[PDB]
Copies of this chain bind each other. A is one copy, B any other.
């Protein structure tokens, strides 16, 4: 299965790298999409290469979506193309994994009303204002949406997402 990542500079390093490798282990093809070609750098200094830009992404060519946290979501959520990618994939019922600030992108896509999930505790009120029934758990599974809160939840986060992709 082809998994797409929507991220940018200042992403939370492990929230991108962990799922990237965890999914590759299963045989899934992983792709990193961002504003421009070249590379992006995490808040901790890890550098990763961008596979394609938001503009070149066709939501229909991917089967799953992963939204890492960090400061990147606040910039990504202002990009019409990136938000539409997430809106389409999420609404189509495709698997979507989010952690930390990653769901800010889904908030902006306007697809979370009535959904159940979690996020970085610091933005729980924004998730709630978007219609999310917020849960304080290491991992929440709501249909196609698997969400976690912080790096400490990584193990549980992909444990559930991997199952969904099987």
Docked pose: A14 CA to B130 CA in angstroms: 31
Interface residues of A in 24-48 (CB under 8 A from B): 24-25, 44-46
Docked pose: A151 CA to B20 CA in angstroms: 11
How near does chain B come to A87, taking the closest CB pair, in angstroms? 13
Give chain B residues whose Cβ lies under 8 Å from the Cβ of A108: 125
On chain A, the number of residues with a Cβ less than 8 Å from chain B's Cβ atoms is 33
Q: What mask results when residues 44 to 87 of chain A are scored 1 for a CB within 8 Å of chain B, else 0?
A: 11100000000000000000000000000011011000000000
Given A17-B18, A44-B44, A125-B130, 20 other A-B residues pairs in contact with their CB atoms under 8 A:
A13-B46, A14-B17, A17-B151, A17-B154, A18-B18, A21-B158, A22-B155, A25-B155, A25-B156, A44-B45, A45-B45, A46-B151, A75-B122, A77-B122, A78-B121, A104-B125, A107-B129, A123-B126, A126-B126, A126-B130
